[PDB]
Amino acid sequence: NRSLIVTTILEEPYVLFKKSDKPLYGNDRFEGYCIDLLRELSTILGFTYEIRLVEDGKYGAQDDVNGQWNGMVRELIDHKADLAVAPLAITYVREKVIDFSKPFMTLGISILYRKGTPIDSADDLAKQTKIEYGAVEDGATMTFFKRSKISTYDKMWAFMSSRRQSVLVKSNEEGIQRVLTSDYAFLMESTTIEFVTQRNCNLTQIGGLIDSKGYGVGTPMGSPYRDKITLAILKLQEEGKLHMMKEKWWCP
Amino acid sequence: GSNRSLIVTTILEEPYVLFKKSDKPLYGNDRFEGYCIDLLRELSTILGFTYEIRLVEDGKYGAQDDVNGQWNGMVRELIDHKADLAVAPLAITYVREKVIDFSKPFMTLGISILYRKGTPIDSADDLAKQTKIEYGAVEDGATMTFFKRSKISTYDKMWAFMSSRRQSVLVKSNEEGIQRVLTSDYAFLMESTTIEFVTQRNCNLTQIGGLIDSKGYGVGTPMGSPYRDKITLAILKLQEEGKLHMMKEKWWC
Ligand SMILES: N[C@@H](CCC(=O)O)C(=O)O
Ligand SMILES: N[C@@H](CCC(=O)O)C(=O)O
Ligand SMILES: [Cl-]
Ligand SMILES: [Cl-]
Ligand code: NA
Ligand code: NA
């Protein structure tokens, strides 16, 4: 049968290029939690696949003026991919235009910052400007802030939007670097914070979770794969396999 | 000329669904309160439906009979189109999703252990390796089914014990499980969000260990229902607004 086209994005420890002196080709180039997940799905559901990194390097948001989506979300809308297997947040605005499986991981927005400071919450950031803060451009965190009517978060969006050329970044890795090299706090998904703080012992999560959401496999709206992938994820969960995969891929 | 009211099946479970305390007799939907009742009210305004709440006739969440293959509980009510929706702390599971549809989750949780304070018991593994302290779960719910189906060594040993002693250790409700913890040397396998509620109100009890699994509660619908995806959208919008968190804080030593 026809191999499914799978869009994804580089994001440690979900999807990475394998380290090797030997040049690698095709799907063999990739590893990570989401690649392990994809492999399990392919075996359970009986399909073959071809991984392609999303050409624009984006997760996906809707343009304010022209209404067009970008990123992995747009690839699915345009039927240029069959699945998006990535740390792709299931959100209200995305679910209106693409389908998602049920979640394979649950998480929420939180804050990455340096240790040792009196900053303890988003409210602490919102009331000041000396410590800058931001998020990945055209992802779910940015979109949460952009849409929020909660006073702390709407204040924070006004600031991010004002300073966007400096404080919105293209990737989580660029956000981490901004935290390490300037006085900056990064609004980041909590499962990623967990990974980063285990490896950067001067960094910490600030406060708790600001929201709650899950990562799901994306499909074009109406795809028959969406419900099949939900069943496969539920079966993996029941067996403990997703927890094992998390432990596989995830200070003094 | 109005649309038919949806029949919503549910089950008594504090603080999700309860009868209101009142000296005045109450009728119809006005009898009920709780997190799931507030959720249902929000869904009905978002989606534009009216409804009638009915407690599941057989008092069960739902499991499949291994001899005759029939389901029971709220799951069976949906299969048979005796209800339009199930709005309850109904776990989304692989075996249920094969026969009914669920919305995406409105709450995430996992199985853990409820026991009395003051003990060296620290995990399911510690319980499994002994028999002096009995343990069990709600009959014909998701926790029981997780154990019955598990191939993990600790949990399959637990199921063998629970099954052997089921007339004594499987119970009809979380409340009966709590009373067993309080009146005998018994540990109850219970969902974590319910443990959180119970231990905040009885300071003699505690959670033992962490979460054994991960799952969500979802609104159940019959397979193929058009309400499933609409309710998923309404849930995602409520979460994006922070309203589910506010509802949890309202209802929850
Ligand atoms: N995982 C996010 C990107 C990272 C973020 O927004 O914090 C998404 O699905 O858009
Ligand atoms: N909420 C569970 C019942 C309680 C339990 O099994 O622990 C269900 O959906 O079956
Ligand atoms: Cl009617
Ligand atoms: Cl779904
Ligand atoms: Na990237
Ligand atoms: Na959708």
Ligand code: NA
């Ligand atoms: Na289903």
